[PDB]
Amino acid sequence: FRIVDDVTTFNDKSDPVKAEMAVGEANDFLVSELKVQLEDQFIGTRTINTSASIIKDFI
Amino acid sequence: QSYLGRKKRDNEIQDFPAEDVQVIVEGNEARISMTVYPIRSFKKISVSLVYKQQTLQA
Known part of the structure; x- marks a missing residue:
């Protein structure tokens, strides 16, 4: 027996x-x-100049 | 000009225009005219701090 589709x-x-x-x-x-993951990492942190680069690397 | 230059050298005056220094001699009298910017001590500092937005990319 097998499942035809889900x-x-x-x-x-x-x-x-x-x-x-x-x-x-x-x-x-x-x-x-x-x-x-984004909430625990970036929310509450300073909006430094390298924030955009760090977020891109994390993604 | 030499006397005023020494004052500027010693910071006793702010600055003076050399061109405006005019000397007129007639008989015994010798009329002298000069302009001097006096030295002053700071007693009020006004700062106009303005906050603005900046956009980051990449």
């Missing part, structure tokens, strides 16, 4: 993020992890 209830296949669990799963973890 399609979600949302039938609009034009949006693979909503339609496909795997694609949406990667988007959620990518977005969520980036959200948490």
Whole structure:
């Protein structure tokens, strides 16, 4: 036995993020992890001249 | 001019214009006219601090 597909209830296949669990799963973890890491790192720090370069290197 | 130059050298005066120094001699009298910028001591310092935005890139 095997699973034919992991399609979600949302039938609009034009949006693979909503339609496909795997694609949406990667988007959620990518977005969520980036959200948490940036807050702990950069919020509350001084807006030094090299702040933009440091943020780019972190990304 | 030499006398005023020494004063400027010793910082006893601020500056003087050499051109405006005019001397008129007529008989016994000898009229002299000169301009001198006097030396002054600081007693008030005004600072106009202005804050502005700056945009960073890269």
